[PDB]
Amino acid sequence: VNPTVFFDIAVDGEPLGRVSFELFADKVPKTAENFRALSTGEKGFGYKGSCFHRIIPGFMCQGGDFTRHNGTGGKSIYGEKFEDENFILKHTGPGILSMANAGPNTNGSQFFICTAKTEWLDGKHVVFGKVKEGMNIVEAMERFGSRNGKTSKKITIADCGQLE
């Protein structure tokens, strides 16, 4: 059974709400497991307290840099980077959860949540989950984005973990 994780999102420290994700462990188990472990913090590091550093209304919300907190960092549970597992799943519309990267085989911890269909990313970013509950929270996070992605408030993962 595919695991479920949640983010409790805050805006400048004030609660906004909870987004939950199904992780497609049946199709991308290594990529799903990295995201699951970083969400629980069980390796001693992970997403808790990190921010969404790039939000572009009409496209996506991007986050996951918990090492440098500037959009340049992040690391996986397998090392700084790991390989593209597969490109089976596509960027079909809002809610898709997919890995950010800096070219082939450079997955770390950064990820993005689509707010539209982003088909030209197919075959270049590994899709590994989707929003289950709280998509309207992600839509609400777009209110603080901009054309080049700089955010107007601090959008943070105040808490995260795995749902039973």
Binding site: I56, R68, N70, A102, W120, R147, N148
Partner: protein, 169 residues
């Protein structure tokens, strides 16, 4: 005060942002922070006259080559950057120049050819080859290092001079 609209273009990872941040903030860090699109402002005294530079730092991400027309219409002068250890980035230069010529519908666009990362020992682009390309375009060629600051002010200030001349035509 006269305001010059400069645009920095070139392939991913050649150092466009590192060059711009060295000029604006006098700072270099080795981290990779690929650009969506950033804009900066700096006032400088060039040839005894104060100039205001508006600098657009553009994305090298190759998938969006059809999204460049708007900023090429707006920009007055272009810094065309390759990296001296990346031969593909030097080949990409002509692609950028053709695109700027088409969008502006002109062969006379203020432009400077910049060969960046000259601090590195692993050169794959011969300096003479780049000088010859710039001569064929009729534009200046400057070798730079965003890491050591070599040529950084020279490249941007030279582009300002090219636009200054263009404006007096």
């Amino acid at each position: 005060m006269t305001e010059y609209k400069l645009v920095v273009v070139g392939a991913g990872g050649v150092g466009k942002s590192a060059l711009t941040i060295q000029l604006i903030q006098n700072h270099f860090v080795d981290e990779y922070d690929p650009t969506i699109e950033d804009s900066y402002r700096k006032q400088v005294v060039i040839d005894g006259e104060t100039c205001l530079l508006d600098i657009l730092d553009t994305a090298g991400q190759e998938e969006y080559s059809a999204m460049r027309d708007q900023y090429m219409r707006t920009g007055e002068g272009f810094l065309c950057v390759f990296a001296i250890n990346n031969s593909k980035s030097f080949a990409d230069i002509n692609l950028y120049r053709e695109q700027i010529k088409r969008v502006k519908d002109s062969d006379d666009v203020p432009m400077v050819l910049v060969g960046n990362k000259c601090d590195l020992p692993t050169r794959t682009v011969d300096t003479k080859q780049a000088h010859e390309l710039a001569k064929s375009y009729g534009i200046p060629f400057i070798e730079t290092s965003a890491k050591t600051r070599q040529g950084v002010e020279d490249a941007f200030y030279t582009l300002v001079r090219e636009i200054r001349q263009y404006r007096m035509k």
